[PDB]
Design a binder for this molecule. Structure first.
Ligand SMILES: CCn1c2c(c(=O)[nH]c1=O)[C@H](c1ccc(C)cc1)C1=C(COC1=O)N2
Length: 127
């Protein structure tokens, strides 16, 4: 099978705005996770073709990744912070569903998610 098209990262028909919370998600939350030693499997859409995982997109129908999130934030694609938080959660959940508990990639995701949840407790109040 071919890869699917990646998630959209811009849409002229989708209203957009900047908020202090979305700015924080880009400058602090994404920045922190993106540069983490365990980030690399999550920095781009899953390339099931190159990686040889012919069942990935038969199993995962809600793909999401930090490369997509990074572009959505940079492009001001989101209207609210919850949209972005949901994308991170979807990314982690996909990993936990596709892979076996105890697999190294699951441990990587869990470490990233722990950090993620800490940082979103620090979300600033909306101005
Ligand atoms: C996020 C998508 N994904 C990936 C892999 C996987 O086993 N399961 C999976 O859900 C695979 C891999 C294998 C072992 C480790 C320690 C990390 C990553 C892999 C990537 C990218 O490069 C790769 O070697 N992604």
């Amino acid at each position: 099978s071919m890869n699917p098209p990646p998630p959209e990262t811009s849409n002229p028909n989708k209203p957009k705005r900047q908020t202090n919370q979305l700015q924080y998600l880009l400058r602090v939350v994404l920045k922190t996770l993106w540069k983490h030693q365990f980030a690399w499997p999550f920095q781009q859409p899953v390339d099931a073709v190159k990686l040889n995982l012919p069942d990935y997109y038969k199993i995962i129908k809600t793909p999401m990744d930090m490369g997509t999130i990074k572009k959505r934030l940079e492009n001001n694609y989101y209207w609210n912070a919850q949209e972005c938080i949901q994308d991170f959660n979807t990314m982690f959940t996909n990993c936990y569903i596709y892979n076996k508990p105890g697999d190294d990639i699951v441990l990587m995701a869990e470490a990233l998610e722990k950090l993620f949840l800490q940082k979103i407790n620090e979300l600033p109040t909306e101005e």
